């Protein structure tokens, strides 16, 4: 019954996602989110290839930073300056040319309190 992370407004959180590496199908990894009663929203995506793509939703630009560590097969999302409107469940997904592809889901629930 509805457990997650709790962060005060202005605070920070780091998410991580396992990132197995590029396939014929996928060339990166990213996050989307879904807030209560709202549709899924793109958050960020990054290419496995250094320098290829780094996309952000306009609502998170400047506050969230995505990065990759290919030696650890991981991607990370540093979420700074959190605000109440960032309250959502966050989901990792593989990317192809920046678009995110989900099959099957789980997720990390995040509540940001003003």
């Amino acid at each position: 019954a509805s457990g997650g992370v709790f962060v005060q407004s202005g605070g920070s959180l780091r998410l991580s996602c396992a990132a197995s590496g590029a396939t014929s199908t996928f060339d990166g990894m990213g996050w989307f989110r879904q807030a209560p009663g709202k549709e899924k929203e793109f958050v960020s995506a990054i290419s496995y290839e250094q320098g290829s793509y780094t996309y952000y939703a306009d609502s998170v630009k400047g506050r969230f930073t995505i990065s990759r560590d290919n030696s650890k097969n991981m991607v990370y999302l540093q979420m700074n300056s959190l605000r109440a409107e960032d309250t959502a469940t966050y989901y990792c997904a593989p990317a192809y040319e920046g678009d995110l592809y989900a099959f099957d889901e789980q997720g990390t629930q995040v509540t940001v309190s003003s």
Binding site: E41, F42, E97, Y101, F103
Partner: peptide
Amino acid sequence: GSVQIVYKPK
């Protein structure tokens, strides 16, 4: 058989 796509920014 099925997929959910979440598109990158326009």
